[PDB]
RNA sequence: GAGGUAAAAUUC
RNA sequence: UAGGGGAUCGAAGAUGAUCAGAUACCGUCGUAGUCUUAACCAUAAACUAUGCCGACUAGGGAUCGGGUGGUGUUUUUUUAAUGACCCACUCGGCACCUUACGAGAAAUCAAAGUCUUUGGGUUCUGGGGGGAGUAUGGUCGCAAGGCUGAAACUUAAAGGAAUU
């Protein structure tokens, strides 16, 4: 149902190949993900760029057409993705939970950090395993940036990414935040690129 | 479930899972319903015209909600050869 | 097949291995060998008749401490000496 | 020998997070100011609060204090967090403009049909 | 009840392998049941290496090491502080403590 | 009077959700007991067993009281709540509360004729909590609830007129026996029955079209 | 008591009993 | 070794209904199962199935619609009287208005609701509901 | 990557 | 049981201490035995306390044995061929790790799963705890013993898992 526009542009394919997003996982490999295609030697695999972009526009399509814009809570306990979820609230409503998940947030309506979202976006299913577990009690769809070795239980439509390098996670958040601004039209044009630089969505060392 | 004349008795026909064709019951708290927007050219997502995909709690506990959504969304017409029927 | 045979021509094994397992009950054991007939001095009866030999002062078992005022009864049809109880509040004076 | 209780650390957290002006790292200006701006019942617990705020004001100018935001790291870190570095972006190729594309990655480019600059470097086993 | 998996040793489908004798109390025990400690040591102590370098007539000399493999039974590896009783969830940790 | 904090709880006071069976469609969790009180005041409380539970301590012997409360009117609505507390009267106050959050619908049908007024269950269901297995078997008209007197009152408060039951295991306890029949009545909807093979096109949740009032404000 | 030394108690009970039985035949 | 092929071919189907597999692969399926799979295909419990043909036994891939609770087997093949079908349709069928205890008559593998109309009986194989 | 260690102590 | 061996260890036993007593633990000495040939006996916590055959259900990393593919590595005399090793895959193994859709009273279990929505083929054993693995009878053995195996009577608890 997407006629001609929403395909992979060559101006965005240089961003994915240079940020090492196409690098897969180690010798460990989950059978549930049919994303292995022309595995490079020394044990690694190659994530399909043409499949990553198309599984990313369905993730931004669920974020759209929601009446409250603030019920999309991004979860991040990984140190490489703490900066890319606070600026996810600067453009959508999208209240984040960074650092500690403080469990008892989806249930336990007594506490002061009780959030009742509609769509939970997860950086990594291993470290944010409490967000996936508590979402199975209160009926929340879960989107996760699953690696090829990440567990894929209790998660919906996922974007195959790498989480081993500094630049592989943050550019995916740049693509998710851009497509939820092209939808719900603030920038009416899709041919011209988005206004500001993609270096803003990358974690900075304290040194 | 009806009777001799009129009277559609015993209401609440429950929801069925779109993947495994199983009944999603009341206390199944792992059930997930997906709302997918109908978009067109030049923005305009038009909130209100949804594509409702309902998934049960068994598919998520098995760990196949990522793969069952690939079958149920490509046959509607909004994907391409990413998901292969041959395996 | 849960241990038991399920053959269509195997009703003989299912009727012998029951008879090899009926000897584990109590009710099936007391009926065939005549335990009510040989031992347990009532010969398959409900009541009987006897002669008092002497009176007993049988002390009750723990934790209770009482004397149950029993008697010794010798039967007529067998001749066995069987202890007996008086289920009232002082009918031992009513018997001799 | 002596460890402060929680109620000393509770009130000292309430003082630093909102009274970072009008207070310095000197004890004598931290002691006589709590007589009016706070309602402390006794002198002994009052000096223990001001004795612990003075201990924490010493370690603010030395380094960042974790878990305490005193209405000035809310402003100075947000103007720092938008770093926006210049055209040396490490994604947009300006130094060695052709992309370092391996052999199996080069087959992925021709599979999707787009035309990109590719520099083939064979990796060893 | 069955608190373990192999329940005494490292025998997986053999029945019987080899009996060995303990070094502390001369107890007969199977070889995979007795725990092992490759107690490698220097032949001299850390305090006797200073006086041996002054008494040596050699310019350079490689220090020998006394290697020995000695086994323990279960009863004389707990009285001696070698192994300790652990919690129920930490029994499964088979990594050597560093 | 009462201030809701759950997103579903603000659609209850406003009146956008009218029937409980609209909440049962989308498997919506119920975390506050005022939700199904303003939509169905016809529930009736009933206590089943109050037994003392004890914990051995250093100085003396600590004891509490467990209360088993089964609520629910007719027309296929029950609720089972088991709560322990330090008193007898305090345990039955919070035993009603858990039973209000655990409301599950019961599908009843016919024995062998679609004549009218459904009285018995549709299919044979069996729940298992602990060792107790309760096999609910559909009965003809006027047959009565053939069950234990603790299981009978849970089925008299269920809208089921006639049912046949079979048990197995240590059914002398009432902790695992009443919970085994509570799984069994919930398994009536979890069974693929024919003449339900038609596909309804998955209607929109009430949290999507009534999200203007169902917010923080 | 221990089920082995009750077994050997009945074991020497057998040898003592059948010896008295064998000298009366 | 193998004793009942029809019993070993339904266990692959029932495990597929529980795990959610939309297809099975059974072997060494005979034509008794072929006349049995057409009973469920007529009533709608399974979709289409394709008997592949090697020379040995053949394999079947049953595309299932997910509308099947359990299709079982009754071993061995008991003899069934007309006055004894009420005993089998009450023990192992959940309700009276549906459920199909199939039983092999001289006309073929056939459910009990058609055996009442044809007034024949025979040996039992299993049950479909 | 090595770093200490065995007296006797029965019953209500 | 009958020969050969009989270095150590060492049921019996003798002594030295400990101890109220110590026929023990500990110390020392030392037969039978441990070894072997030719026969017997044939029980073990002979335990994975889990019959065997067949099918299906779930992911992951190792390893053994065989085999097939490498733009492979190394040994090299002139390139080889093997062998070793690496990568990928597949059978037959001993297993293990994470999980629970399932099972169980629970501990736990890829099997103890596919079991009240209780039928794949098939063999053996058990029916409250004692008295009894006893009595008697039969049979086997040189003997010690093995196998088969009750009753009278007595009791209402015995027992399993887990929590404090
Ligand atoms: Mg016996
Ligand atoms: Mg009995
Ligand atoms: Mg007589
Ligand atoms: Mg007479
Ligand atoms: Mg007498
Ligand atoms: Mg123990
Ligand atoms: Mg052995
Ligand atoms: Mg009691
Ligand atoms: Mg007590
Ligand atoms: Mg009762
Ligand atoms: Mg005794
Ligand atoms: Mg004589
Ligand atoms: Mg000797
Ligand atoms: Mg001695
Ligand atoms: Mg002495
Ligand atoms: Mg002696
Ligand atoms: Mg001695
Ligand atoms: Mg034996
Ligand atoms: Mg063992
Ligand atoms: Mg045994
Ligand atoms: Mg496996
Ligand atoms: Mg399972
Ligand atoms: Mg369970
Ligand atoms: Mg008995
Ligand atoms: Mg025996
Ligand atoms: Mg005998
Ligand atoms: Mg004899
Ligand atoms: Mg002899
Ligand atoms: Mg004998
Ligand atoms: Mg008895
Ligand atoms: Mg008593
Ligand atoms: Mg304890
Ligand atoms: Zn030892």
Curated annotation (Swiss-Prot), chain A:
Query: Where does it reside?
Result: Cytoplasm
A single BP term in Gene Ontology:
cytoplasmic translation
Chief localization:
cytoplasm
Outcome of gene disruption: Reduction in growth rate, a decrease in free 40S subunits, an increase in the amount of free 60S subunits and a decrease in polysome size.
Keywords attached to this entry? Acetylation, Cytoplasm, Ribonucleoprotein, Ribosomal protein, Ribosome biogenesis, rRNA processing
Q: Which GO terms describe its cellular component?
A: 90S preribosome; cytoplasmic stress granule; cytosol; cytosolic small ribosomal subunit
The answer to whether keyword Phosphoprotein applies is no
Q: Does the keyword Signal apply?
A: no
For this protein, what is any one GO molecular function term?
A: structural constituent of ribosome
Query: Which superkingdom is the protein from?
Result: Eukaryota
Q: N-acetylserine is carried by which residues? A: 1
Q: How is it modified after translation?
A: N-terminally acetylated by acetyltransferase NatA.
Briefly, what is this protein's role? Component of the ribosome, a large ribonucleoprotein complex responsible for the synthesis of proteins in the cell. The small ribosomal subunit (SSU) binds messenger RNAs (mRNAs) and translates the encoded message by selecting cognate aminoacyl-transfer RNA (tRNA) molecules. The large subunit (LSU) contains the ribosomal catalytic site termed the peptidyl transferase center (PTC), which catalyzes the formation of peptide bonds, thereby polymerizing the amino acids delivered by tRNAs into a polypeptide chain.
The entry assigns this protein to a family as follows: Belongs to the universal ribosomal protein uS2 family.
Instruction: Look up the further comments and give them.
Output: Present with 93700 molecules/cell in log phase SD medium.
Q: What is this protein called?
A: Small ribosomal subunit protein uS2A
Show the taxonomic lineage: Eukaryota, Fungi, Dikarya, Ascomycota, Saccharomycotina
Q: Which residues of the full protein are shown?
A: 2 to 208 of 252
UniProtKB/Swiss-Prot annotation, chain C:
The UniProt entry lists the main location of this chain as cytoplasm
The answer, when asked if Metal-binding is one of the entry's keywords, is: no
Q: What else is known?
A: Present with 10600 molecules/cell in log phase SD medium.
Q: Gene encoding this chain?
A: RPS23A
Which cellular compartments is it found in?
Answer: Cytoplasm
Keyword Ligase present in the record's keywords: the answer is no
Instruction: Enter cross-link residues for Glycyl lysine isopeptide (Lys-Gly) (interchain with G-Cter in ubiquitin).
Output: 55
UniProt protein name: Small ribosomal subunit protein uS12A
Gene Ontology cellular component list: cytosol; cytosolic small ribosomal subunit; ribosome
UniProtKB/Swiss-Prot annotation, chain D:
Q: Which domain of life is it from?
A: Eukaryota
- Note from the entry: Present with 30500 molecules/cell in log phase SD medium.
GO cellular component terms, A-Z: cytosol; cytosolic small ribosomal subunit
Q: Does the keyword Ribosomal protein apply?
A: yes
Annotated organism of origin: Saccharomyces cerevisiae (strain ATCC 204508 / S288c) (Baker's yeast)
Q: Which UniProt keywords apply?
A: Cytoplasm, Ribonucleoprotein, Ribosomal protein
Cellular location(s): Cytoplasm
Instruction: Tell me its family.
Output: Belongs to the eukaryotic ribosomal protein eS17 family.
* Chief site of localization: cytoplasm
| One GO MF term attached to the UniProt entry | structural constituent of ribosome
Q: What does this protein do?
A: Component of the ribosome, a large ribonucleoprotein complex responsible for the synthesis of proteins in the cell. The small ribosomal subunit (SSU) binds messenger RNAs (mRNAs) and translates the encoded message by selecting cognate aminoacyl-transfer RNA (tRNA) molecules. The large subunit (LSU) contains the ribosomal catalytic site termed the peptidyl transferase center (PTC), which catalyzes the formation of peptide bonds, thereby polymerizing the amino acids delivered by tRNAs into a polypeptide chain.
Q: Which Gene3D superfamilies does the UniProt entry name for this protein? A: Ribosomal protein S17e-like
Q: How does it assemble?
A: Component of the small ribosomal subunit (SSU). Mature yeast ribosomes consist of a small (40S) and a large (60S) subunit. The 40S small subunit contains 1 molecule of ribosomal RNA (18S rRNA) and 33 different proteins (encoded by 57 genes). The large 60S subunit contains 3 rRNA molecules (25S, 5.8S and 5S rRNA) and 46 different proteins (encoded by 81 genes).
The record's gene field reads RPS17B
Swiss-Prot record, chain E:
Protein name, as recorded: Small ribosomal subunit protein eS26B
Please name the GO terms of the biological process aspect recorded for this protein, alphabetically. cytoplasmic translation; maturation of LSU-rRNA from tricistronic rRNA transcript (SSU-rRNA, 5.8S rRNA, LSU-rRNA); ribosomal subunit export from nucleus; ribosome assembly
Any further remark recorded for this protein: Present with 503000 molecules/cell in log phase SD medium. There are 2 genes for eS26 in yeast.
Q: Which family does it belong to?
A: Belongs to the eukaryotic ribosomal protein eS26 family.
Residues shown, of full length = 2 to 99 of 119
Could you name the Gene Ontology cellular component terms for this entry? Answer: 90S preribosome; cytosol; cytosolic small ribosomal subunit
Function noted in UniProt:
Component of the ribosome, a large ribonucleoprotein complex responsible for the synthesis of proteins in the cell. The small ribosomal subunit (SSU) binds messenger RNAs (mRNAs) and translates the encoded message by selecting cognate aminoacyl-transfer RNA (tRNA) molecules. The large subunit (LSU) contains the ribosomal catalytic site termed the peptidyl transferase center (PTC), which catalyzes the formation of peptide bonds, thereby polymerizing the amino acids delivered by tRNAs into a polypeptide chain.
> Origin, by domain of life?
Eukaryota
Q: What is the scientific name of the source organism?
A: Saccharomyces cerevisiae (strain ATCC 204508 / S288c)
What molecular functions are annotated in GO for this chain? mRNA binding; structural constituent of ribosome
């Amino acid at each position: 149902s997407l006629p001609a526009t929403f395909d992979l542009t060559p101006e965005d394919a240089q961003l994915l190949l240079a940020a090492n997003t196409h690098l897969g996982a180690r010798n460990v490999q989950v059978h549930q993900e049919p994303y292995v295609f022309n595995a490079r030697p020394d044990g690694v695999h190659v994530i399909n760029v043409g499949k990553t972009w198309e599984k990313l526009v369905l993730a931004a399509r669920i974020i759209a057409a929601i009446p409250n814009p603030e019920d999309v809570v991004a979860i991040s306990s990984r140190t490489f993705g703490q900066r890319a979820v606070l600026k996810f609230a600067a453009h959508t409503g999208a209240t984040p939970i960074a650092g500690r998940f403080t469990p008892g947030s989806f249930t336990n309506y007594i506490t002061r950090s009780f959030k009742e979202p509609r769509l939970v976006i997860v950086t990594d299913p291993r470290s944010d395993a409490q967000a996936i577990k508590e979402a199975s009690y209160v009926n929340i769809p879960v989107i996760a940036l699953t690696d090829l070795d990440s567990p894929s239980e209790f998660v919906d439509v996922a974007i195959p990414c790498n989480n081993r390098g500094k630049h592989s996670i943050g550019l995916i958040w740049y693509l998710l935040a851009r497509e939820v601004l092209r939808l719900r039209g603030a920038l009416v044009d899709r041919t011209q690129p988005w206004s500001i630089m993609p270096d803003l969505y990358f974690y900075r060392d304290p040194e | 479930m009806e009777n001799d004349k009129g009277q559609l008795v015993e209401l609440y026909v429950p929801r069925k899972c779109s993947a495994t064709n199983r009944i999603i019951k009341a206390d199944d708290h792992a059930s997930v319903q997906i709302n997918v927007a109908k978009v067109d050219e030049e923005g305009r997502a038009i909130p209100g015209e949804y594509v409702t995909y309902a998934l049960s709690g068994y598919v998520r506990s098995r760990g196949e909600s990522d793969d069952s959504l690939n079958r149920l969304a490509q046959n509607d017409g909004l994907l391409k050869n990413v998901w292969s029927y041959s395996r | 097949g849960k241990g038991k045979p399920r053959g269509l021509n195997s009703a003989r094994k299912l009727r012998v291995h029951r008879r090899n397992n009926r000897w584990a009950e109590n009710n099936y054991k007391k009926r065939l060998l005549g335990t009510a007939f040989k031992s347990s001095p009532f010969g398959g009866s409900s009541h009987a008749k006897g002669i008092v030999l002497e009176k007993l002062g049988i002390e009750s078992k723990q934790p209770n401490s009482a004397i149950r005022k029993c008697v010794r009864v010798q039967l007529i049809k067998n001749g066995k000496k069987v202890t007996a109880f008086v289920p009232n509040d002082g009918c031992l004076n009513f018997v001799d | 020998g002596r460890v402060r209780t929680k109620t000393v650390k509770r009130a000292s957290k309430a003082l630093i997070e909102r009274y970072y002006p009008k207070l310095t790292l000197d004890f004598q200006t931290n002691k006589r100011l709590c007589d009016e701006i706070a309602t402390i019942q006794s002198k002994r617990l009052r000096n223990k609060i001001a004795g612990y705020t003075t201990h924490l004001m010493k370690r603010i100018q030395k380094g960042p204090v974790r878990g305490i935001s005193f209405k000035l790291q809310e402003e100075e870190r947000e103007r720092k967090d938008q770093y926006v570095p210049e055209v040396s972006a490490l994604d947009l190729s300006r130094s060695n403009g052709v992309l370092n594309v391996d052999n199996q990655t080069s087959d992925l480019v021709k599979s999707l049909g787009l035309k990109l600059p590719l520099s083939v470097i064979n990796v060893s086993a | 009840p069955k608190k373990r998996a192999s329940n005494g040793r490292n025998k997986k489908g053999r029945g019987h392998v080899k009996p060995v004798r303990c070094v502390n109390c001369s107890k007969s025990i199977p070889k995979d049941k007795a725990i092992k400690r490759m107690a490698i040591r220097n032949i001299v102590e850390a305090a006797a290496v200073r006086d041996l370098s002054e008494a040596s007539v050699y310019p350079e000399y490689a220090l020998p090491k006394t290697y020995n493999k000695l086994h323990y039974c279960v009863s004389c590896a707990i009285h001696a502080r070698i192994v300790r009783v652990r919690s129920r969830e930490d029994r499964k940790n088979r990594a050597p403590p560093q | 009077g009462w201030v809701p904090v759950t997103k579903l709880g603000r659609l209850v006071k406003a009146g956008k959700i009218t029937t409980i069976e609209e909440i049962f469609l989308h498997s919506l969790p119920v975390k506050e007991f005022q939700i199904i009180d303003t939509l169905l005041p016809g529930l009736q409380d009933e206590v089943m067993n109050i037994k003392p539970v004890q914990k051995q301590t250093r100085a003396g012997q600590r004891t509490r009281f467990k209360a088993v409360v089964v609520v629910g009117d007719s027309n296929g609505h029950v609720g089972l709540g088991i709560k322990t507390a330090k008193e007898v009267a305090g345990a039955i106050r919070a035993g009603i509360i858990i039973a209000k959050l655990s409301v599950i619908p019961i599908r009843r049908g016919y024995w062998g004729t679609n004549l009218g007024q459904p009285h018995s269950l549709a299919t044979k269901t069996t729940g298992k909590c602990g060792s107790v297995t309760v096999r609910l078997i559909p009965a003809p008209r006027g047959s009565g609830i053939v069950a234990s007197p603790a299981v009978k009152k849970l089925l008299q408060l269920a809208g089921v007129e006639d049912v046949y039951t079979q048990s197995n295991g240590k059914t002398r306890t009432l902790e695992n026996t009443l919970k085994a029949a509570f799984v069994a009545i919930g398994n009536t909807y979890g069974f693929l029955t024919p003449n339900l093979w038609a596909e309804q096109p998955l209607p929109v949740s009430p949290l999507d079209i009534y999200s203007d009032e169902a917010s923080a404000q | 008591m221990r089920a082995k030394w009750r077994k050997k108690r009945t074991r020497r009970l057998k040898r003592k009993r059948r010896k008295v039985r064998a000298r009366s035949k | 070794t193998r004793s009942s092929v029809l019993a070993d071919a339904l266990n692959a189907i029932n495990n597929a209904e529980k795990t959610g597999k939309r297809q099975v692969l059974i072997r060494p399926s005979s034509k008794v199962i072929i006349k049995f799979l057409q009973v469920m295909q007529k009533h709608g419990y399974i979709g289409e199935f394709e008997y592949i043909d090697d020379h040995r036994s053949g394999k079947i891939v049953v595309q299932l619609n997910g509308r099947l609770n359990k299709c079982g087997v009754i071993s061995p093949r008991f003899n069934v009287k007309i006055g004894d079908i009420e005993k089998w349709t009450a023990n192992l069928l959940p309700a009276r208005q549906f459920g199909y205890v199939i039983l092999t008559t001289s006309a073929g593998i056939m459910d009990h609701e058609e055996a009442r109309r044809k007034h024949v009986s025979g040996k039992i194989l299993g049950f479909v509901y």
